[PDB]
């Protein structure tokens, strides 16, 4: 019994555990009520645990979204500040929708953010798209990359298939074995 991380969120606790239990060390999530969770590993496993905290940069930051920097708390917002909150909402919605495809487990979608459509007289430049996707195993993984480029194309103003970069991959091998208590 020796602590690693306390005061963690519900997001951060189940992801630090899922790291350590992948690397054959058993974590013990202790709840502390109003303070947040706390993760304690065993004392022989403490050295390897603090290595993978440094290596995977745990505890994770909350998922940075672009609308979190341009909030609705401001009563007045610049026209750049509502295009960047619009484009933030679209790419959140596309990655909510790619996860509802067949085979896809996770998705992260990025938009080329136009800023100066009305600042210099230049017309709006072409929109660029980039998507990740994590698949189940056994997928014909070179063939779903044409569905997503078809789907992401007709979801925007004028994009080309050279402007959509889908970088997808199969998931890791399933962690199903329990780690195992160190005998002392």
């Amino acid at each position: 019994d020796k602590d690693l991380l306390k005061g963690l969120d519900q997001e951060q606790a189940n992801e630090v555990i899922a790291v350590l239990q992948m690397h054959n060390i058993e974590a013990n999530k202790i709840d502390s009520g109003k303070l947040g969770y706390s993760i304690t590993v065993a004392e022989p496993d403490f050295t390897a645990a603090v290595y993978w905290i440094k290596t995977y940069q745990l505890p994770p930051r909350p998922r940075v979204e672009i609308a979190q920097m341009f909030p609705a708390d401001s009563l007045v917002s610049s026209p750049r500040a509502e295009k960047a909150r619009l484009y933030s909402a679209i790419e959140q919605r596309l990655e909510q929708s790619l996860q509802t495809m067949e085979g896809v487990l996770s998705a992260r979608v990025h938009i080329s953010y136009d800023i100066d459509a009305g600042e210099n007289g230049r017309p709006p430049k072409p929109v660029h798209l980039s998507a990740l996707a994590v698949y189940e195993r056994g997928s014909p993984l070179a063939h779903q990359i044409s569905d997503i480029k078809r789907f992401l194309k007709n979801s925007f103003a004028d994009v080309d298939y050279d402007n959509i970069s889908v970088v997808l991959s199969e998931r890791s091998d399933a962690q199903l074995q329990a780690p195992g208590t160190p005998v002392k």
Binding site: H143, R150, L176
Partner: protein, 194 residues
Amino acid sequence: AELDSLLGQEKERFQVLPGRDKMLYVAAQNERDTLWARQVLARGDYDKNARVINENEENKRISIWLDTYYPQLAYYRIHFDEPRKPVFWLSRQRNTMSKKELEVLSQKLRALMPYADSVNITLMDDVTAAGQAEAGLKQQALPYSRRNHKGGVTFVIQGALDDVEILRARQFVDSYYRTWGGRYVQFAIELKDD
């Protein structure tokens, strides 16, 4: 309990195979019920040792083996429709092995698969392999381009494809990749524009 009852409630998606190597083998059907059966054998509620073999994983497990001890071997796929007697498709026109060495190959693939009783190596034509992939590809009305090679053929399907020709393709490719594998003919569904 015995493993025919430790699995799900209805028992025919899981074909339990008595092995050879002091072990018992579970023939899962698709990728998802592999994760159903592997969860039983990993939580630890079955006392003996047991594996979950898949039709898709035991193809690419022997292909790790067969890319080492028998390189430059032109073959297609092992079929596990009957997992006790699987069928190893071999190319008829691209091998020089006579039937002196084919039972040497079958009795060594039998040693890889303790569930298998005998591995039926049958030889089929590579002309029909690219024939069934082209007669089926024109039947889906797909604009393609054949690129013949030795030991391979590519059906490049480019162009600004609409919605139904991406869907008729992936229904055909996945119904083809299950049968003939992806070792002779590759389908390159790349999607350009004008």
